[PDB]
Amino acid sequence: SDAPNFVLEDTNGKRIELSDLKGKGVFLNFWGTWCEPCKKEFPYMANQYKHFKSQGVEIVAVNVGESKIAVHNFMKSYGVNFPVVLDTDRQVLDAYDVSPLPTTFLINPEGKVVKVVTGTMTESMIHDYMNLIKPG
């Protein structure tokens, strides 16, 4: 299944579009600063990102609607080193049909959804999920 495309701005103002990432695996996260699991999981994605970014896996952590400042504070507190976008009007969330939070979509290099993950992820899981969608 094709991942609905979207265009959003990351927390530095940069226009990011899903289809611009064709060729890379995309670890697509929907999250909010009130999710306990993301407090645990963002450090793990950060640490796996050190390894996977040069393998051609990208993270896109879609924050569901919160203020630039609430997001910035969460990113500093949990050592985030990956791209975060702002779903300001929560329209990408509805395009993805998401509930609960977090939910992660594993999108392969050809732009298709290979796995939808809800519920808890260990760092070992995150590792595997990223190997599942890496180009090489």
Where residue 71 sits, what CATH number does that domain have? 3.40.30.10
Are the C-beta atoms of 112 and 2 separated by less than 8 Å? yes
Backbone angles phi, psi at 103, to 5 degrees: -140, 140
Q: Say whether 32 sits in a helix, a strand or coil.
A: coil
H-helix or E-strand spanning residue 42: helix 36-52
Method: X-ray
Say if strands 7-9 and 15-17 run parallel, antiparallel, or are unpaired.
Answer: antiparallel
Q: How far is CA 12 from CA 68, 71, 120, 130, in A?
A: 10, 12, 29, 25
What's the domain count of the chain? 1
Resolution (A): 2.6
Are the C-beta atoms of 109 and 22 separated by less than 8 Å? yes
- Domain of residue 95 covers 1-136
